[PDB]
Design a protein around this nucleic acid. Structure first.
Ligand SMILES: *C(=O)[C@H](Cc1ccccc1)NC(C)=O
Ligand SMILES: [Mg+2]
Ligand SMILES: [Mg+2]
Ligand SMILES: [Mg+2]
Ligand SMILES: [Mg+2]
Ligand SMILES: [Mg+2]
Ligand SMILES: [Mg+2]
Ligand SMILES: [Mg+2]
Ligand SMILES: [Mg+2]
Ligand SMILES: [Mg+2]
Ligand SMILES: [Mg+2]
Ligand SMILES: [Mg+2]
Ligand SMILES: [Mg+2]
Ligand SMILES: [Mg+2]
Ligand SMILES: [Mg+2]
Ligand SMILES: [Mg+2]
Ligand SMILES: [Mg+2]
Ligand SMILES: [Mg+2]
Ligand SMILES: [Mg+2]
Ligand SMILES: [Mg+2]
Ligand SMILES: [Mg+2]
Ligand SMILES: [Mg+2]
Ligand SMILES: [Mg+2]
Ligand SMILES: [Mg+2]
Ligand SMILES: [Mg+2]
Ligand SMILES: [Mg+2]
Ligand SMILES: [Mg+2]
Ligand SMILES: [Mg+2]
Ligand SMILES: [Mg+2]
Ligand SMILES: [Mg+2]
Ligand SMILES: [Mg+2]
Ligand SMILES: [Mg+2]
Ligand SMILES: [Mg+2]
Ligand SMILES: [Mg+2]
Ligand SMILES: [Mg+2]
Ligand SMILES: [Mg+2]
Ligand SMILES: [Mg+2]
Ligand SMILES: [Mg+2]
Ligand SMILES: [Mg+2]
Ligand SMILES: [Mg+2]
Ligand SMILES: [Mg+2]
Ligand SMILES: [Mg+2]
Ligand SMILES: [Mg+2]
Ligand SMILES: [Mg+2]
Ligand SMILES: [Mg+2]
Ligand SMILES: [Mg+2]
Ligand SMILES: [Mg+2]
Ligand SMILES: [Mg+2]
Ligand SMILES: [Mg+2]
Ligand SMILES: [Mg+2]
Ligand SMILES: [Mg+2]
Ligand SMILES: [Mg+2]
Ligand SMILES: [Mg+2]
Ligand SMILES: [Mg+2]
Ligand SMILES: [Mg+2]
Ligand SMILES: [Mg+2]
Ligand SMILES: [Mg+2]
Ligand SMILES: [Mg+2]
Ligand SMILES: [Mg+2]
Ligand SMILES: [Mg+2]
Ligand SMILES: [Mg+2]
Ligand SMILES: [Mg+2]
Ligand SMILES: [Mg+2]
Ligand SMILES: [Mg+2]
Ligand SMILES: [Mg+2]
Ligand SMILES: [Mg+2]
Ligand SMILES: [Mg+2]
Ligand SMILES: [Mg+2]
Ligand SMILES: [Mg+2]
Ligand SMILES: [Mg+2]
Ligand SMILES: [Mg+2]
Ligand SMILES: [Mg+2]
Ligand SMILES: [Mg+2]
Ligand SMILES: [Mg+2]
Ligand SMILES: [Mg+2]
Ligand SMILES: [Mg+2]
Ligand SMILES: [Mg+2]
Ligand SMILES: [Mg+2]
Ligand SMILES: [Mg+2]
Ligand SMILES: [Mg+2]
Ligand SMILES: [Mg+2]
Ligand SMILES: [Mg+2]
Ligand SMILES: [Mg+2]
Ligand SMILES: [Mg+2]
Ligand SMILES: [Mg+2]
Ligand SMILES: [Mg+2]
Ligand SMILES: [Mg+2]
Ligand SMILES: [Mg+2]
Ligand SMILES: [Mg+2]
Ligand SMILES: [Mg+2]
Ligand SMILES: [Mg+2]
Ligand SMILES: [Mg+2]
Ligand SMILES: [Mg+2]
Ligand SMILES: [Mg+2]
Ligand SMILES: [Mg+2]
Ligand SMILES: [Mg+2]
Ligand SMILES: [Mg+2]
Ligand SMILES: [Mg+2]
Ligand SMILES: [Mg+2]
Ligand SMILES: [Mg+2]
Ligand SMILES: [Mg+2]
Ligand SMILES: [Mg+2]
Ligand SMILES: [Mg+2]
Ligand SMILES: [Mg+2]
Ligand SMILES: [Mg+2]
Ligand SMILES: [Mg+2]
Ligand SMILES: [Mg+2]
Ligand SMILES: [Mg+2]
Ligand SMILES: [Mg+2]
Ligand SMILES: [Mg+2]
Ligand SMILES: [Mg+2]
Ligand SMILES: [Mg+2]
Ligand SMILES: [Mg+2]
Ligand SMILES: [Mg+2]
Ligand SMILES: [Mg+2]
Ligand SMILES: [Mg+2]
Ligand SMILES: [Mg+2]
Ligand SMILES: [Mg+2]
Ligand SMILES: [Mg+2]
Ligand SMILES: [Mg+2]
Ligand SMILES: [Mg+2]
Ligand SMILES: [Mg+2]
Ligand SMILES: [Mg+2]
Ligand SMILES: [Mg+2]
Ligand SMILES: [Mg+2]
Ligand SMILES: [Mg+2]
Ligand SMILES: [Mg+2]
Ligand SMILES: [Mg+2]
Ligand SMILES: [Mg+2]
Ligand SMILES: [Mg+2]
Ligand SMILES: [Mg+2]
Ligand SMILES: [Mg+2]
Ligand SMILES: [Mg+2]
Ligand SMILES: [Mg+2]
Lengths: 136, 49, 386
RNA sequence: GUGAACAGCCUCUAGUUGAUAGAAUAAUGUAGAUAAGGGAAGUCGGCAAAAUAGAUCCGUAACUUCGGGAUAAGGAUUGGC
RNA sequence: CUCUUAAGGUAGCCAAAUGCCUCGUCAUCUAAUUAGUGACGCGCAUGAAUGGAUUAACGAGAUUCCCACUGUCCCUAUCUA
RNA sequence: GCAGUCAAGCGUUCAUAGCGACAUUGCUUUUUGAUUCUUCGAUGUCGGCUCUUCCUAUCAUACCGAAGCAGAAUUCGGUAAGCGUUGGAUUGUUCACCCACUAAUAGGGAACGUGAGCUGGGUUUAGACCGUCGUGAGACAGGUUAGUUUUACCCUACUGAUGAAUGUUACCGCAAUAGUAAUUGAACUUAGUACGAGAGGAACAGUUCAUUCGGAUAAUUGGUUUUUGCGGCUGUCUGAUCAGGCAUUGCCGCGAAGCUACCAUCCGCUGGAUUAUGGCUGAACGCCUCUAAGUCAGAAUCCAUGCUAGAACGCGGUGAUUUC
């Protein structure tokens, strides 16, 4: 998370290290996002900074609009597809990896999200749940 | 305490066990164990098992 | 030259040496503080670990995100037979530590601890405590002489007890003897409280209670002579390394011309007397009570024993402490449950939790049914039972 | 016999059943493997390993000495009666 | 314009395997590149059978990137001889 | 390379908040030289991976002291090595330069730590190419390409393992001593409050979690399959069927038990004595002063609480103690 996130997030299973190519599910024009950094990672030797649902990552657009390529931008993960664990006992995971484009302040760049977003991201970022469809 | 039904077979999923799976068009499936989650990914017909 | 990238050291130096202990019963290194105003009671207890299960309960934590919402936790079921008092041990404070000078036994001991004192019960003449029973044959001048010294000296008093192993489904049939220090006030009434309890059992209805952070002392499950990568957590060597990749590289510098005691070396992993603290008791059940697994939300008649019993253990026909989290030690092993060493107040202690659903599905495979009456109702009739 | 085949695998005719053995299954090895999520971020370097693989049909670029590139690339089908 | 040689590097090509200064300058590839490629060049010491320049096809040759793929790595774990 | 001394000046005014010329005294030796003392009947010489330990000239964290410190931020200094210091593109590189995370991403030593630990990419061979130089053979801190990494079973050290002898044997203990670990951040609230003309913008207490490390553990989830447990399939073999053999565990799906994973879960305690510093009373010095005698509050410090071993020559209690 970092600065600008409302509330804390319980730790779930990390599934997205640096170098992962997720999808981009909105009307911003970007097709995929390439993870180069994770906000709030550890400084331990020989650990790739891994991400999860609701984490704020730095992404680079590889496929999509040419205006969005060759630049660094923040991103918020909305689908993880790694089997994490909630406290009530369910082991749930999405089908693919996905994220949205965002500013360093936390506001959304797009207007809609064409896929499902889990409640660990919809309760941590209020602007994602305002443009999402069905939760979980 | 709420017991959900299995999406593939139809058994009783108890709180604590079971693996949930959500499809890309946001349809929620609830599997009992690593058996029905494996046979779902192989495109098996539950009316033939 | 220095390290190119500095990393935290693998392992914990305060747990060296990692050699094997004395016995499989982990002794108690420290007992809680004696209070002069509290009534006389036990401060530790010995049980047998038997299986684990997953329990749905309500989180009574205001300010969190899952307040008043169901959470699941993994608990352990330690077995609790009735435990009987057979001995009283005193200790006088010396300038070289403590020193036992009088240990008073009981008169008619059971055959469990008599089997403990011999290595060959089938060749022995069973003549233990036969000349000690001549002390109880007189009027009792020599009996009260040993206890009057405990009424005068021996400021701290420990009590020899043992678990009734014949009410336990283990295949050992030999009781474990241990000392329990008593932290009740008026030290003259310590030996006067255990004199009445000779050949009298002690339950856990007064020792432990509901919603209590307790300690746990046991011996780690052994794993034999384990390699250095899995023992210490060392980063593995690459694939191209000659004569070993699952090892540790160079030990140290030239000077000092020795191997240091803090490097990762291969050896024994397991069979370690550990002490895990701050575990919360969720349920203390009775042995004679039907439906020990019955919950006020559930209201059904089912016990805590799973379908087919516990894995490698059997069935619980006695008392049990249902404590939070993983307890050290494996199945079928003696484990000493200890009272807390301090008054814990940290917003996770003193929490009046209440269980909602107690699982009793089979742990031998994939648990699909809780009770066998539920299995007969869902599956229906079969080829058999006709 | 399967198969394009003196490939691999399996049996008949013919020769062997010889290579110190027994009891246990610790570490570390040699050899053969499998791993959720990510996909080289490891490393001097995709080293090693994995993936593609036969046949039939469709389709096949820049360039060129017009011979090639070419099995280019990229898709589909395959069993029993 | 001047000095001087027998003649004074022509057609091409180039930080190329040949460029010390250089990790040259610019553009592209990348979030980031002393690498790769495309150009400029008064080029310590490029150059015409000392063979120059360009080349289809070919290569257990040297190097760079992308797709597919994989414990190589995050991060280790297990089984067998 | 680092730290001083003096104070001409800078700092709107003011030498010493922060700096500081001209001079000058030293320390370190992680630079490069100087020397040739040791080694040429051989110390395996670069770099990285991996691993432990130590030093402080302290980057961050704990507590404080000064400011041209209003708040926020920043700068200087003290006690302090307890603890933390990275993911990457390129380069064989140490070094260097960017991207980016982070509380911060510091400098080092240990035969320029470490090749019977590894890699061998570079250079330090024999093949070959180009440039320059030489008539030539050939040379080149000029460039490029391909080029065997040997042995521990000895002693010690260390990680573990027993074990004779203290009348024998059995059980329950005491504890010398040795090791010792937890670290750090964000959010909610305090609070848009203190402060400020505004812009801007905290802190203690309380609560929810997270970073890294450590010890456990298999309920569940995920992995592993020689349970060759069951089912399915191909080739061939036993006349067919049934049931099987073989294909160095044949292949595929599922798979408990066991092992195992921040790809799983649980847990990580409390007092006392201090340093820096801020004070009390109080002289030296009728006054003044943290001090000279006394004394108070005080750091991630130290010692204990606790935790891990139990001196195999440290110790105590108790049970039994043989008849050809
Ligand atoms: C230069 O120092 C080396 C030394 C050397 C001698 C023998 C074997 C290996 C290295 N010599 C060269 C020519 O490189
Ligand atoms: Mg939360
Ligand atoms: Mg899209
Ligand atoms: Mg590394
Ligand atoms: Mg499984
Ligand atoms: Mg260092
Ligand atoms: Mg590194
Ligand atoms: Mg103690
Ligand atoms: Mg004690
Ligand atoms: Mg006595
Ligand atoms: Mg025996
Ligand atoms: Mg049995
Ligand atoms: Mg074993
Ligand atoms: Mg093993
Ligand atoms: Mg572990
Ligand atoms: Mg090798
Ligand atoms: Mg290692
Ligand atoms: Mg050692
Ligand atoms: Mg089980
Ligand atoms: Mg043949
Ligand atoms: Mg063969
Ligand atoms: Mg032989
Ligand atoms: Mg053998
Ligand atoms: Mg092995
Ligand atoms: Mg994998
Ligand atoms: Mg998964
Ligand atoms: Mg996968
Ligand atoms: Mg991929
Ligand atoms: Mg790389
Ligand atoms: Mg790539
Ligand atoms: Mg190379
Ligand atoms: Mg490299
Ligand atoms: Mg490189
Ligand atoms: Mg190479
Ligand atoms: Mg490649
Ligand atoms: Mg290699
Ligand atoms: Mg290869
Ligand atoms: Mg595979
Ligand atoms: Mg294809
Ligand atoms: Mg081609
Ligand atoms: Mg057909
Ligand atoms: Mg010219
Ligand atoms: Mg000419
Ligand atoms: Mg011409
Ligand atoms: Mg040139
Ligand atoms: Mg070049
Ligand atoms: Mg540069
Ligand atoms: Mg461009
Ligand atoms: Mg590259
Ligand atoms: Mg370049
Ligand atoms: Mg070029
Ligand atoms: Mg020049
Ligand atoms: Mg030439
Ligand atoms: Mg000519
Ligand atoms: Mg080639
Ligand atoms: Mg050839
Ligand atoms: Mg084996
Ligand atoms: Mg220095
Ligand atoms: Mg002035
Ligand atoms: Mg002034
Ligand atoms: Mg001065
Ligand atoms: Mg001076
Ligand atoms: Mg000076
Ligand atoms: Mg000197
Ligand atoms: Mg230096
Ligand atoms: Mg000199
Ligand atoms: Mg010399
Ligand atoms: Mg040498
Ligand atoms: Mg040597
Ligand atoms: Mg040599
Ligand atoms: Mg030698
Ligand atoms: Mg002033
Ligand atoms: Mg100010
Ligand atoms: Mg500010
Ligand atoms: Mg020190
Ligand atoms: Mg240290
Ligand atoms: Mg730290
Ligand atoms: Mg770096
Ligand atoms: Mg690297
Ligand atoms: Mg590199
Ligand atoms: Mg910074
Ligand atoms: Mg040397
Ligand atoms: Mg040196
Ligand atoms: Mg060296
Ligand atoms: Mg060596
Ligand atoms: Mg060597
Ligand atoms: Mg070499
Ligand atoms: Mg080489
Ligand atoms: Mg030589
Ligand atoms: Mg050569
Ligand atoms: Mg040369
Ligand atoms: Mg070059
Ligand atoms: Mg070379
Ligand atoms: Mg070769
Ligand atoms: Mg060896
Ligand atoms: Mg030898
Ligand atoms: Mg040796
Ligand atoms: Mg030894
Ligand atoms: Mg004798
Ligand atoms: Mg606010
Ligand atoms: Mg102002
Ligand atoms: Mg534990
Ligand atoms: Mg599986
Ligand atoms: Mg299998
Ligand atoms: Mg079969
Ligand atoms: Mg099949
Ligand atoms: Mg057949
Ligand atoms: Mg038939
Ligand atoms: Mg045969
Ligand atoms: Mg095989
Ligand atoms: Mg399993
Ligand atoms: Mg195993
Ligand atoms: Mg966890
Ligand atoms: Mg952990
Ligand atoms: Mg915790
Ligand atoms: Mg305590
Ligand atoms: Mg003290
Ligand atoms: Mg005091
Ligand atoms: Mg101070
Ligand atoms: Mg005063
Ligand atoms: Mg005076
Ligand atoms: Mg003072
Ligand atoms: Mg004083
Ligand atoms: Mg004085
Ligand atoms: Mg005072
Ligand atoms: Mg501490
Ligand atoms: Mg202790
Ligand atoms: Mg502790
Ligand atoms: Mg001893
Ligand atoms: Mg001694
Ligand atoms: Mg010894
Ligand atoms: Mg002693
Ligand atoms: Mg004795
Ligand atoms: Mg003794």
């Amino acid at each position: 998370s970092g600065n600008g996130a409302q509330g804390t997030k319980f730790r779930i299973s990390l599934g997205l290290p640096v170098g992962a190519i997720m999808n981009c599910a909105d009307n911003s024009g970007a097709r995929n996002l390439y993870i180069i950094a994770v906000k709030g990672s550890g400084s331990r030797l020989n650990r790739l900074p891994a991400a999860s649902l609701g984490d704020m990552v730095m992404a680079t657009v590889k496929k999509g609009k040419p205006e969005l390529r060759k630049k660094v931008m923040p991103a918020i993960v909305v689908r993880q597809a790694k089997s994490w664990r909630r406290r009530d006992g369910v082991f749930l995971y999405f089908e693919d990896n996905a994220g949205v484009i965002a500013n360093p302040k936390g506001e959304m760049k797009g207007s809609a999200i064409t896929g499902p977003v889990g409640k660990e991201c919809a309760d941590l970022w209020p602007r994602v749940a305002s443009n999402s469809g069905v939760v979980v | 305490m709420k017991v959900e039904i299995d999406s593939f077979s139809g058994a009783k999923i108890y709180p604590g066990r079971g693996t949930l799976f959500v499809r890309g068009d946001s349809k929620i499936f609830r599997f009992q164990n690593s058996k029905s989650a494996s046979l779902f990914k192989q495109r098996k017909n539950p009316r033939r098992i | 030259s220095h390290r190119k990238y500095e990393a935290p050291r693998h392992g914990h130096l305060g747990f060296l040496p990692r050699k094997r202990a004395a016995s499989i019963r982990a002794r108690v290194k420290a007992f809680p503080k004696d209070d002069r105003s509290k009534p006389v009671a036990l401060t530790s207890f010995l049980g047998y670990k038997a299986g684990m299960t997953t329990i749905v309960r309500d989180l009574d934590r205001p300010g969190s995100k899952f307040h008043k919402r169901e959470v699941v936790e993994a608990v352990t079921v330690v077995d609790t037979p009735p435990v009987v008092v057979v001995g009283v041990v005193g200790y006088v404070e010396t300038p070289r530590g403590l020193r036992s000078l009088t240990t008073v036994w009981a008169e008619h001991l059971s055959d469990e601890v008599k089997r403990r004192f011999y290595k060959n019960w089938y060749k022995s003449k069973k003549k233990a405590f036969t000349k000690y029973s001549a002390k109880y044959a007189q009027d009792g001048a020599g009996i009260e002489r040993e206890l009057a010294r405990i009424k005068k000296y021996a400021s701290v008093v420990r009590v020899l007890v043992h678990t009734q192993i014949r009410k336990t489904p283990l295949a050992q049939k030999k009781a474990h003897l241990a000392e329990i220090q008593l932290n009740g006030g008026s030290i003259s009434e310590k030996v006067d409280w255990a004199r009445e309890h000779f050949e009298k059992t002690v339950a856990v209805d007064s020792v432990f209670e509901q919603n209590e952070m307790i300690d746990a002392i046991a011996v780690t499950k052994g794993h034999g002579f384990e390699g250095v990568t899995h023992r210490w957590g060392t980063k593995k060597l690459p694939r191209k390394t000659h004569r070993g990749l699952r090892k540790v590289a160079c030990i140290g510098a030239w000077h000092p011309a020795h191997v240091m005691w803090s490097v990762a070396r291969a050896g024994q992993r397991g069979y370690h007397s550990r002490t895990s603290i701050n575990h919360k008791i969720y349920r203390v059940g009775k042995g004679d009570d039907e439906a020990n697994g019955a919950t006020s939300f559930d209201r059904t008649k089912k016990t805590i024993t799973p379908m087919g019993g516990f894995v490698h253990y059997g069935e619980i026909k006695n008392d049990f402490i249902m404590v939070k989290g993983c307890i050290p030690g494996n199945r079928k092993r003696i484990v000493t449950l200890r009272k807390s060493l301090y008054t814990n107040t940290s917003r996770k202690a003193l929490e009046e939790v209440s269980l909602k659903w107690i699982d009793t599905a089979s742990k031998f495979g994939k648990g699909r049914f809780q009770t066998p009456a539920e299995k007969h109702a869902f599956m229906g009739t079969l080829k058999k039972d006709l």
